[PDB]
Amino acid sequence: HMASMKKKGSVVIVGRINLSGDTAYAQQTRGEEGCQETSQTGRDKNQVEGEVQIVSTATQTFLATSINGVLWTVYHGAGTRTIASPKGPVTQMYTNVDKDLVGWQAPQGSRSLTPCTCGSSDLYLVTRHADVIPVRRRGDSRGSLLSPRPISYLKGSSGGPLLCPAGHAVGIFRAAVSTRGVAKAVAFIPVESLETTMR
Ligand SMILES: COc1ccc2nc(C)c(O[C@@H]3C[C@H]4C(=O)N[C@]5(C(=O)NS(=O)(=O)C6(C)CC6)C[C@H]5/C=C\CCCCC[C@H](NC(=O)OC(C)(C)C(F)(F)F)C(=O)N4C3)nc2c1
Ligand SMILES: [Zn+2]
């Protein structure tokens, strides 16, 4: 009934994939009790750093990637949720269920990836475990893993980047193409589609 209707919590940044040096590694910045509290209030005063965030709702954990001053992730992870920030929940500025895409203004302190204009097909997928997986681009929105992996390896990495050799953003990881549980290929949201959404 109306008086007891609940509100969904905010997406919460709970860590990051550190790409600042020679070694990629995952960092946790918020434990579970802080996350639950931050999801309810929408107030997250942690300092944000880096391009790839680890984010969580009460029921899911996935990634989010800053490109052109927007923190982007998948609709199938975030739905229409706000994201927590120092002064309270922040409403999405982009929502496109047909592209499986959402975005919020990039957090203060984050850094953004540059959209790739290289036109290269040798790509690199960054996972929530800070694995950097070589991927050969196979079409506008697909790439094959040079070494296939069980889907278990990729679960929770939606919203992460596919990068070119120079570290530019080529797309956002959306779905795994799996045969008998082995991911031979991935589908991604091309960065051109993000740039069209921004218009
Ligand atoms: C709710 O409104 C919407 C709107 C648009 C959507 N668009 C799509 C595409 C959609 O697909 C959903 C969601 C997505 C998904 O699991 N992603 C990943 C992830 O890690 N997620 S996640 O972080 O753990 C989390 C679950 C917390 C957030 C990267 C995946 C890692 C491992 C694969 C696990 C096995 C699932 C394989 C499946 N393969 C698949 O569908 O491949 C085809 C058929 C070729 C196509 F055609 F999809 F490309 C698959 O990958 N997925 C099914 N759901 C949507 C829902
Ligand atoms: Zn590039």
TrEMBL record:
Compartment list: Host cell; Host membrane; Virion membrane
Residues in Peptidase S29 domain copies: 23-199
One of the protein's GO biological processes: virion attachment to host cell
Gene3D superfamilies from the UniProt entry: 2.40.10.120
Annotated residues for binding of Zn(2+): C116, C118, C164, H168
Reactions it catalyzes: ATP + H2O = ADP + phosphate + H(+)
GO molecular function ontology, one term from the record: serine-type peptidase activity
SUPFAM superfamilies reported in the protein's UniProt record: Trypsin-like serine proteases
One GO term describing the cellular component: virion membrane
Record keywords: Capsid protein, Glycoprotein, Host membrane, Host-virus interaction, Hydrolase, Membrane, Metal-binding, Protease, Transmembrane, Transmembrane helix, Viral attachment to host cell, Virion, Virus entry into host cell, Zinc
Region forming the signal peptide: none
Protein name in UniProt: NS3 protease
Organism encoding this protein: Hepacivirus hominis
